[PDB]
Curated annotation (Swiss-Prot), chain C:
It is found in: Virion; Host cytoplasm. Interacts with capsid protein VP1 and capsid protein VP3 in the mature capsid. The chain holds residues 77 to 331 of 2178 of the full protein. Forms an icosahedral capsid of pseudo T=3 symmetry with capsid proteins VP2 and VP3. The capsid is 300 Angstroms in diameter, composed of 60 copies of each capsid protein and enclosing the viral positive strand RNA genome. It comes from Human rhinovirus 3. This is Capsid protein VP2. Signal peptide: none annotated.
């Protein structure tokens, strides 16, 4: 599909695409020492 | 017969849009341009020029004495002037900088304050100019004042002192309209020593202060000013 | 060994000297020059009297009193009776010129006072009455005398408000125009070189003043004890790169 | 990246940028690093919104007028009755834009005119009439309308636009000055006469616009109000001046009210914050 | 093809993924194949509709106001009479969108405003008036309208849109924050004062919008209702927080009703299905 | 003067469409972005984080 | 972004771009002899 | 079904615009041009011709 | 600037350009024998 | 650039462009430089608005 911007300002443009750079880790594993699934959580 | 769909906003007149329109005078030839000195391209060009600050705000009517800062001989430790740093208000409101700043919503940048001495050549003095960043009250004495950004001025051949007010801020833009969160601090002046006049001389000596913006400066979000209005349309 | 303070200006058969200058301003960073073919409209040949008109003419002196408000001169009006310049100015239908304005005020290392010397392109004056009343021709055409701002206002003349620049704008912002100060503790003089500034290549020198030189006391004059309470102010002006055209019989003006 | 500030350390030099001479008439570009130890920072800014094209590039209302649509039968002065009206195009009647334009001495640009016409029926009427307005560009010298339906409205050579009330009309107009630029100010006269006006010059003439409703009359009267907006395109401005401080009182005159004496805000003490 | 699940068989290892330590503050990505024998299957899915651009990319109503068109003759308070109205742009007055925005702490985006104006004539009127509304963007510091036809509506520098009642107006607005992002929350004050407000910051200022009908008055009154919709474009969001549980009670305050005590649904027995 | 034909739906306001519109603030420069930890791109990112279940629903 | 002019006359076109040739000097330092920041303003 | 937005001025009739329009007589063949002396292209062509001035305005 | 014709008939097109082939002579000097400015009109 | 006027100086010739014979029915294109000392200037003009297409357009 095609799109050309009709306006000078960047704000005028439509929606930005899909980020495709998801990374739940910053929220799900913000641990200092790496923990590996399957190994003792605490040794 | 190309199928289209018209969108919301169709037919609106937004004073701020920029599009093509038909010329009512087709084929018309405008007068040739001739060279004219003093071309202005950006407003940031002219606010770099210093203009006088009416710091002697005291009085009832505007008068040339508003631009004159009084200085007294043989006074020690005393305060010469004080003011908040509200460029869209107070003493800065009528200046060229404050005048143009009020056509915009946000401002950011460093400011330039010059103080020009007009007293006799055979006199002497040492003054202290200070900028107190936001977060406290205006200094109450020279001791409190000197703890911040300041310049010690030695009066001599070089008639003017220039102090820059470095962008000292957390947030990157402040509002021109006086708002508490976006305040810029205070500005004050005191005698580091004192003014000393030569024999056969007396009275007051005055200081002229100028304000302008540094190349640092930025102004955004254009809007209407509070420095002009009207009750009826004018006629010839 | 040379200084920014000592200077000589030689224009024609007149030489001016100052030993207490503070540089000099060349309006809008542009030096005067003659009219070019690209910019020219009028097909006529221009007359360039040179050294006969491009020399320094000294205006009648002013007296700086401690209560003085300021003075205003309109060009080319102020030089309309100045030798061959004034003559040429009234025989031609059109003229063009730039100037070298030299304002003088010497004093004593015991005096204090400050003058603002400014050149304002298109200084359209406000009337005494306000409303829709215009400032009569003769009031904007005082000649050498100029407009003395502490003179009582008359009907149809300008306002005498230095604070309002006689035009509805504030004094402090006059610094946006090419200006120079005469700070006694420092200065002695002020020099300003003015190029031709107009929306037309050439113009009528009698029905339109391109600029008005304004000398305004900012810091009051304060003389030493026992000294004379006044100081004179002298204005010397030299037309530069003058051109004339549309020569004919002597222009007829009101008075 | 352009630098807003550079890293700068302590000093003890003979090179004193903090001292100057304002007597010269100059303002030297000092930077905070001339009087303070600084850090490197970036402008992250170009200054687009302050370009004069920007500054004068938005539509501003420059005039509001009114016309009507009645029964012109027996009416001897169509202009007074409000069957048609004029407007001597000028940009100094409404003050908001006037102060902006006047920041400069000479100004050159193209105009983008947008005309809005709204209708009102203040007294008893069965319905709201759908009217058509004609806006005629009347250059100086062209014959002036005298009646709402003159031969003049034929407008064979004068540009005219027809549009509906409730709608808007938009057209651009080239810089129509007889000189190289428009005069925001003019310290002169038309000729050396003792009594001719001062300031006002044909050097600012942009024209006169004539308005009328093309429709005949209904049973009720309809009041049409016209608002003219001006937008400057392809701007050029020379010689900046001091902002206007005092109120305006008249078109094309720098005259100001004589009882206006306090433009600068006052304190009590120069020492207060 | 991305795998949703892989083929996985029986186990008897020392590697026990079923056991962990939530004390650490982490949530390890276990998959059903860590505790069950599985088969290979495909995601057949990208997750487009959950992108924050999507989530905040649709128009939501953020304000409803009203204005009128009467005869302003003798009326001393145009604002109270409803001849014009204001709106201090805020996105926390209507709760549907507010809960969505607040899922994050700082939020940066462009705005796409769509304004709808519908009319109503609740009492005896001969016809329905065709009105034109003006919407003015009044930045803090610009002069505020006082009468429905002030010099302020000249709007020489303030952006304004004129549109018809029944129609809609649409425009985009750049991220106008003084900081790098908008604050959904702010645990601070304007200055260290004992009595200044808490939370509300100019750091969330988006402006104030002024509204009025440009037409004069008819014989009847016409009531115009304005609905403002906001759509976020070019979105950026940081630091996710806990969803709002309790009702909202005030704009820009986390305050909640004190008599609201049962947000979680109750059972009788923890053992029932 | 390019001949067109307008289609059904012309003039509608569908809260869910995505098109260009004129900027009310032309030439305006937004504040520069600064780095801020904890950027969320998709909601599927945060539901992977475990939160407590109020299983003792009794009361 | 793209723009093609639909009209014959130059006046018909939209706004001109940003000048990018700012020079405050004609207004801030119109001095004849050059002054250098840091050196004696007057010698 | 190409999305558009109509601008201010839409529907106006400016006597001075210059655009294309459909021909009411499609397929019609105009008479051939024949040579005719005295072709005028610009009005500046004819004002270069001197004509008498009624200078004896008296009467 | 650009223009493409949307109609089949030549009449449908907009205004023709500027002639640039002005020649006041057919009107100002339709003399049989050439007259040269500066030489005797009649000899 | 097309020239509106050329630079022209004094004269004392036998070539008299100021004299003609309107009896012939012609109007010779004299220019101000035929009777006055002139300076060079440019047309800065094409004459678009006077084309008959314009005039009746
Ligand atoms: Ca009805």
């Amino acid at each position: 599909y095609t799109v050309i911007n009709y306006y000078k300002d960047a704000a005028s443009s439509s929606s930005a695409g899909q980020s495709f750079s998801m990374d739940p880790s910053k929220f799900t594993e913000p641990v200092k020492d790496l923990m590996l699934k399957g190994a003792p959580a605490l040794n | 017969g190309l199928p289209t769909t018209t969108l919301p906003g169709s037919g609106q007149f937004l004073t701020t849009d920029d599009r093509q329109s038909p010329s009512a005078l087709p084929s018309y030839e405008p007068t040739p341009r001739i060279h004219i000195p003093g071309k202005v391209r950006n407003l940031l060009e002219i606010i770099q020029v210093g203009t006088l600050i009416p710091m002697n705000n005291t009085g009832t009517n505007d008068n040339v004495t508003n631009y004159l800062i009084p200085l007294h001989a043989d006074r020690q430790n005393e305060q010469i002037f004080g003011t908040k740093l509200y460029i869209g208000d107070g003493v800065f409101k009528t200046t060229l900088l404050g005048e143009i700043a009020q056509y915009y919503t946000h401002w950011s940048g460093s400011l330039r304050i010059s103080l020009m001495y007009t007293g006799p050549a055979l006199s002497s003095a040492k003054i202290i100019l200070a900028y107190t960043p936001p977060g406290t009250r205006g200094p109450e004495d020279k001791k409190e004042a000197m703890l911040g950004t300041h310049v010690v001025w030695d009066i001599g051949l070089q008639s003017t002192i220039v102090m820059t007010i470095p962008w000292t801020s957390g947030v990157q833009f402040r509002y021109t309209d006086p708002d508490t969160y976006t305040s810029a601090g205070y500005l004050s002046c005191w005698y580091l020593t004192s003014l000393i006049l030569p024999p056969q001389t007396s009275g007051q000596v005055y200081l002229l202060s100028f304000i302008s913006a540094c190349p640092d400066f930025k102004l955004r979000l254009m809007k209407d000013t509070q420095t002009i209005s009207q009750t009826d349309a004018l006629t010839e | 060994g040379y200084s920014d303070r000592v200077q000589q200006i030689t224009l024609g058969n007149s030489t001016i000297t100052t030993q207490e200058a503070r540089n000099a301003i060349v309006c809008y960073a542009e030096w005067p020059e003659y009219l070019s073919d690209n910019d020219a409209s009028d097909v006529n040949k221009t007359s360039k009297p040179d050294i006969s008109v491009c020399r320094f003419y000294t205006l009648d002196s002013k007296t700086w009193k401690a209560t003085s408000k300021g003075w205003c001169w309109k060009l080319p009006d102020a030089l309309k009776d100045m030798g061959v310049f004034g003559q040429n100015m009234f025989y031609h239908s059109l003229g063009r010129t730039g100037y070298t304005i030299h304002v003088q005020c010497n004093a004593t290392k015991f005096h204090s006072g400050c003058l603002l010397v400014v050149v304002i392109p298109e200084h359209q004056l406000a009337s005494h009455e306000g409303g829709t009343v215009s400032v009569k021709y003769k009031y904007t055409h005082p000649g050498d005398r100029g407009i003395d701002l502490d003179t009582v206002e008359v009907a149809g003349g300008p306002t005498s408000d230095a604070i309002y620049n006689m035009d509805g704008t504030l004094l402090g912002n006059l610094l946006i125009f090419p200006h120079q100060f005469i700070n006694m503790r420092t200065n002695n003089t002020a020099t300003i070189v003015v190029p031709y500034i107009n929306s037309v290549p050439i113009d009528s020198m009698t029905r339109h003043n391109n600029v008005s030189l304004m000398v305004v006391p900012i810091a009051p004059l304060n003389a030493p004890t026992g000294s004379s309470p006044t100081l004179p102010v002298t204005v010397t002006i030299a037309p530069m790169c003058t051109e004339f055209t549309g020569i004919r019989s002597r222009s007829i003006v009101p008075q | 990246q352009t630098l807003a500030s550079v890293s700068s350390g302590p000093k003890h030099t003979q090179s004193v940028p903090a001292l100057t001479a304002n007597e010269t008439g100059a303002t030297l570009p000092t930077r905070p690093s001339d009087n303070v130890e600084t850090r490197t920072t970036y402008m992250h800014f170009n200054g687009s919104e302050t370009d004069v094209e920007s500054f004068l590039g938005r539509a501003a209302c420059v005039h509001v007028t009114e016309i009507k649509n009645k029964n012109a039968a027996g009416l001897d002065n169509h202009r007074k009755e409000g069957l048609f009206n004029d407007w001597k195009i000028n940009l100094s009647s409404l003050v908001q834009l006037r102060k902006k334009l006047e920041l400069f001495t000479y100004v050159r640009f193209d105009s983008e005119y947008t005309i809005l016409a709204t209708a009102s029926q203040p007294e008893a009427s069965s319905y709201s009439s759908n009217l058509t307005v004609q806006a005629m560009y009347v250059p100086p010298g062209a014959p002036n309308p005298k009646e709402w339906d003159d031969y003049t409205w034929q407008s064979a050579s004068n540009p005219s636009v027809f549009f509906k009330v409730g709608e808007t009309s938009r057209f651009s107009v080239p810089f129509v000055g007889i000189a190289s630029a428009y005069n925001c100010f003019y310290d002169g006269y038309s000729h050396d006469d003792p009594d001719t006006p001062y300031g006002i010059t044909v050097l600012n003439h942009m024209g006169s616009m004539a308005f009328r409703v093309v429709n005949e009359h209904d049973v009720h009267t309809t009041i049409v109000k016209i608002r003219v907006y001006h937008r400057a395109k392809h701007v050029e401005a020379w010689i900046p001046r001091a902002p206007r401080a005092l109120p305006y009182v008249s078109i094309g005159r720098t005259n100001y009210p004589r009882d206006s004496k306090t433009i600068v805000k006052k304190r009590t003490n120069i020492k207060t914050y």
